[PDB]
Amino acid sequence: NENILKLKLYRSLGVILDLENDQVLINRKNDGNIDILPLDNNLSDFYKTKYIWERLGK
């Protein structure tokens, strides 16, 4: 039920998660258009999420 409210929040930040390929989709409000980010262990996935989210703020 409230699942739409949670998705509406992250979606409001311009993030469009998609498990159809373990990837996070994104939209840059200022300039730019749409961006995509694949999910991977990488060195610090937490930092990667703070990276797109910090840019989404603009």
């Binding site: 409230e2 949670k6 930040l13 998660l17 498990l19 996935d45 999420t49 989210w53 910090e54 703020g57």
Partner: protein
């Protein structure tokens, strides 16, 4: 499954929606970060519901509040809330 996406949603957003149960509708935003930090507020109604649990000084609850009512960009709020929760560490 719905629970699988919800896990990736909270696990990576470090943000959970905890509604307050009692007699009035209330939304408690909780940041998953050892010190455990959370702020009470909602875009619906507004009452004496004023609780802040950062990890440094009230300035956070202050700039954070003025930020949302002054910028009108809920993005600059959760984005600055994250950078602010880090400065607390």
């Amino acid at each position: 499954n719905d629970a699988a996406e919800v896990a990736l949603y909270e696990r990576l957003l470090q943000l959970r929606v905890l509604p307050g149960a009692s007699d009035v509708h209330d939304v408690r935003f909780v940041f998953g970060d050892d010190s455990r930090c959370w702020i009470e507020v909602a875009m619906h109604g507004d009452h004496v519901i004023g609780n802040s649990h950062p990890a440094l000084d009230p300035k956070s609850r202050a700039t954070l509040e003025h930020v949302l009512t002054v910028q009108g960009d809920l993005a600059a709020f959760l984005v600055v809330a994250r950078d602010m929760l880090l400065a607390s560490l």
